[PDB]
Amino acid sequence: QGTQADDLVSAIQQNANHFTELFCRAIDNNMPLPTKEIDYKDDVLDVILNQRRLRNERMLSDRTNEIRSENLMDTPPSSMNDALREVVEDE
């Protein structure tokens, strides 16, 4: 196609241990949602991880609600949306 791409194959072949977590992070950024619902025939690890994801979402939503309810400045919607997302994600 003519575009420039780095030699990812040689980098994996020389330093595969780092690229394991690099690929795992890249997969975790782009994860499709589960089409079928969770049921009683699923793995115990599966329900634990589902509960962990739901608890993470609920913690983020609760902290978002608390920071929005405090109304620190009482004041560009995307600006304080991104800033509040940052303060929740590092709080």
């Binding site: 620190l72 004041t75 940052e86 303060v87």
Partner: protein
Amino acid sequence: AKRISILSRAQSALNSLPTFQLILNSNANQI
């Protein structure tokens, strides 16, 4: 102050915030 400062520099367009000093006054009885 940490959550005030994050909502400050990203809206009115690294930063390290030290531990804030407690200063207190009063008008009670002076022994």
